[PDB]
Amino acid sequence: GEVAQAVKEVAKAVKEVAWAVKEVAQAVKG
Amino acid sequence: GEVAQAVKEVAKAVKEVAWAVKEVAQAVKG
Amino acid sequence: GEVAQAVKEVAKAVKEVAWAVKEVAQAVKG
Amino acid sequence: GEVAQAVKEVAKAVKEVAWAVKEVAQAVKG
Amino acid sequence: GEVAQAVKEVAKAVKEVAWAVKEVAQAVKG
Amino acid sequence: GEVAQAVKEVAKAVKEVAWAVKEVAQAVKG
């Protein structure tokens, strides 16, 4: 359980990277 | 099982990063 | 415990990637 | 075994990110 | 212990990605 | 052991991402 919860924290952080990359794409378009 | 399922959630989030990066490439080309 | 703590260190490093990507977006906009 | 196989799926997804970043580099150069 | 040490190697590699992204930001600004 | 070896494969792939990001920085400079 404790290991699985820490791994889920990694998944959440990776999703934050994906959103930041989408921000870059929008800045390039603009 | 519980840990393996959480690791698979990380793999899915990483694929979302890959798609966001492809969106940057398309914005550069456009 | 020790494995979970190492995984949390990965999560923190991933958040640092997200902030660096945000800096790229601001540089492109500027 | 099952945890190791899930971790290998993460490794493959990370390689797909690397290729997408290479596409950005080619788009910038072009 | 062996698994925790390998996870710490991932954290170090992620920090190397963060620095490479900062180099992109500097190149854009320059 | 088997889990640790799979985690080391992830670290190697993350380093490949860092190198690809450096390629982007060089393309921007050029």
Residue numbers in the entry:
A (entry chain B), B (entry chain A), C (entry chain C), D (entry chain C), E (entry chain A), F (entry chain B): 1 to 30
Question: What's in the article?
Answer:
CCs are quaternary structures comprising two or more α-helices supercoiled around each other with cyclic (Cn) or dihedral (Dn) symmetry. Here, we describe variants with all combinations of the aliphatic residues, Ile, Leu and Val, at a and d to give four classes of peptide: the ββ class, with a and d = Ile or Val; Lβ, a = Leu and d = Ile or Val; βL, a = Ile or Val and d = Leu; and LL, a = d = Leu. Peptides are named systematically appending the one-letter code for the amino acids at the a and d sites to “CC-Type2-“; e.g., CC-Hept becomes CC-Type2-LI. In summary, solution-phase data and X-ray crystal structures demonstrate conclusively that different classes of Type-2 coiled-coil (CC) peptides—i.e., based on abcdefg repeats with predominantly hydrophobic residues at a, d, e and g—adopt a range of distinct states.
As a = d = β-branched specify blunt-ended α-helical barrels, we explored all four combinations of Ile and Val at these sites. CC-Type2-VV, -IV, -VI and -II, were helical and bound DPH in solution consistent with α-helical barrels. Interestingly, X-ray crystallography revealed that oligomer state increased through this series: CC-Type2-VV was hexameric; CC-Type2-IV, heptameric; and CC-Type2-II, octameric. Concomitantly, the dimensions of the internal pore diameters increased: VV, 4.8–7.7 Å; IV, 6.2–9.2 Å; and II, 9.0–11.0 Å. Finally, the modelling offers a clear explanation for why the ββ and Lβ classes exclusively form non-collapsed Cn-symmetric α-helical barrels. Sequences from both classes scored worse when threaded onto most of the slipped and collapsed structures (upper-right-hand regions of Fig. 7e). More specifically, by disfavouring alternative states, potential steric clashes involving β-branched Ile residues at a and d appear critical for maintaining parallel α-helical-barrels structures.
